[PDB]
Design a protein around this ligand. Sequence first.
Ligand code: NAG
Ligand code: RAM
Length: 106
Amino acid sequence: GLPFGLMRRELACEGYPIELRCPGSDVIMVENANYGRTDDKICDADPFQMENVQCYLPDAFKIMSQRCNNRTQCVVVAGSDAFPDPCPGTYKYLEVQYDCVPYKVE
Ligand SMILES: *[C@@H]1O[C@H](CO)[C@@H](O)[C@H](O)[C@H]1NC(C)=O
Ligand SMILES: C[C@@H]1O[C@@H](O)[C@H](O)[C@H](O)[C@H]1O
């Protein structure tokens, strides 16, 4: 298990495509995800866009959930029309935590 061997997670800088992939024949199951900015050390951008570390967008979860739920892999633009606009002027990001489960029982 090269990774943490438990719960997968990806993060991407606003405006770029993000890609999720589940091992074997498992499928991605979005648990939690957000679009915005809650840290200033992620996606190194201009200081002015990195100043506000308080931006949340709950609905971002529904978007990724619908796009990656029950799928082995999914690609989405961490911005553009694919994500609303909660804090315009800040360099956001998209964080998604998910797990991979069998497409069937056991
Ligand atoms: C995923 O598949 C399971 C199969 O039982 C289903 O219950 C669930 O609603 C599906 N979710 C989505 C988003 O398709
Ligand atoms: C800093 C950047 O500014 C605009 O492009 C948008 O508001 C975008 O969501 C934000 O991340």
